[PDB]
Design a protein around this ligand. Structure first.
Ligand code: OGA
Ligand code: FE
Lengths: 20, 219
């Protein structure tokens, strides 16, 4: 089966996450 | 409708039962138009670049998603109404706390402002969060005045796992959409033949997002 991460929309994976 | 009533009487049951929840006329036409101008301004001033993938392999990102995007924190000058949208989304999510599955939502992305520039651009079938990157809720605000999907396409079709029907979401003006980001909701953006704008924020589950950061920082 395909790696679905190769189709998934990019998000910054460190130090850009807004805390609610 | 207060956030409390929208959240508890609609978003929560809807998300827990269907995993896809639409709120029409979210901010009203006046705020909707202002957001649409801010987005046009970004577009016009060349802020958008090719939408990217979590894992880039041999094919171009453009083979997968035909949109161009920018990321907005909400405090940039000329983006304040997008910031109000983001706060309004945030407010809704905060009023859902502890009742959206067993998620504990502590944070989110910046806003992804995305434009499919017509021309048959779309997004192939995908899952927003297939491998546990922390995203638990996808939240999209549409701002396309005069959108006629039978002519301009651009339907978001979602295929909720185990359901007798798929969900066709027209990218209609002032429409807010929530759906679970994980593999329950594979979805696609069907080809668009006019300029289609949407603003996406993804909400993070605290525990899953912590594990994702751990895997990534030691990946
Ligand atoms: O814009 C839409 O309706 C849906 N967009 C996406 O699925 C995405 O960018 O991940
Ligand atoms: Fe998506």
């Amino acid at each position: 089966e395909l790696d679905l991460e190769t189709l998934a929309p990019y998000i910054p994976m460190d130090g850009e996450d807004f805390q609610l | 409708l207060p956030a409390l009533k929208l959240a508890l009487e609609y978003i929560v049951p809807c998300m827990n039962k269907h995993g896809i929840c639409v709120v029409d006329d979210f901010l009203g036409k006046e705020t909707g138009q202002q957001i649409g101008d801010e987005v046009r301004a970004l577009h016009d001033t060349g802020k958008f670049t090719d939408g990217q993938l979590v894992s880039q392999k041999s094919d171009s990102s453009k083979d997968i998603r035909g949109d161009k995007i920018t990321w907005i924190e909400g405090k940039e000058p000329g983006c304040e109404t997008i910031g109000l949208l983001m706060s309004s989304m945030d407010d809704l999510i905060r009023h859902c706390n502890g009742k959206l599955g067993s998620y504990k939502i502590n944070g989110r992305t910046k806003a992804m402002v995305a434009c499919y520039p017509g021309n048959g651009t779309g997004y192939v079938r995908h899952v927003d969060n297939p491998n546990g990157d922390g995203r638990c809720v996808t939240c999209i605000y549409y701002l396309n005045k005069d959108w006629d999907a039978k002519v301009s396409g651009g339907i978001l079709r979602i295929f909720p796992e185990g359901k007798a029907q798929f969900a066709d979401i027209e990218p209609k003006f002032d429409r807010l959409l929530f759906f679970w980001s994980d593999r329950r909701n594979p979805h696609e953006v069907q080809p668009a033949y006019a300029t289609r704008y949407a603003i996406t924020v993804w909400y993070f589950d605290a525990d899953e997002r912590a594990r994702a950061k751990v895997k990534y920082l030691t990946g």
